[PDB]
């Protein structure tokens, strides 16, 4: 992922312009655009993203998710 694209995505999803993405946005995304995800799977994917359980995704957390390579 181009970091320019990452920064643009973060800006778009930071609705309050507070420097974070609220977990509600992620929940909304997974619930509405996700395909038959369970509520526990949604909570798991949220937890995978917001790693400190702050209820907000900061840019470092966002980058960790988006730019990670597991191969």
């Amino acid at each position: 992922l181009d970091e320019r694209e990452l920064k643009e995505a973060f800006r778009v999803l930071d609705k309050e312009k507070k420097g974070v993405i609220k977990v509600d946005v992620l929940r909304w995304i997974l619930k509405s655009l996700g395909d038959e995800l369970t509520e526990d799977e949604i909570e798991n994917m949220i937890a995978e993203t917001d790693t400190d359980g702050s209820g907000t995704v900061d840019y470092e957390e966002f980058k960790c998710l988006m730019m990670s390579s597991d191969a």
Partner: peptide, 24 residues
């Protein structure tokens, strides 16, 4: 941990939403 299917879906959906919202 997340399975790669779920992690890939998560990343895909996040980007789709960003693209959608940019568009209005």
């Amino acid at each position: 941990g997340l399975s790669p299917e779920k992690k890939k879906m998560l990343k895909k959906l996040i980007m789709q939403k960003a693209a959608e919202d940019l568009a209005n």
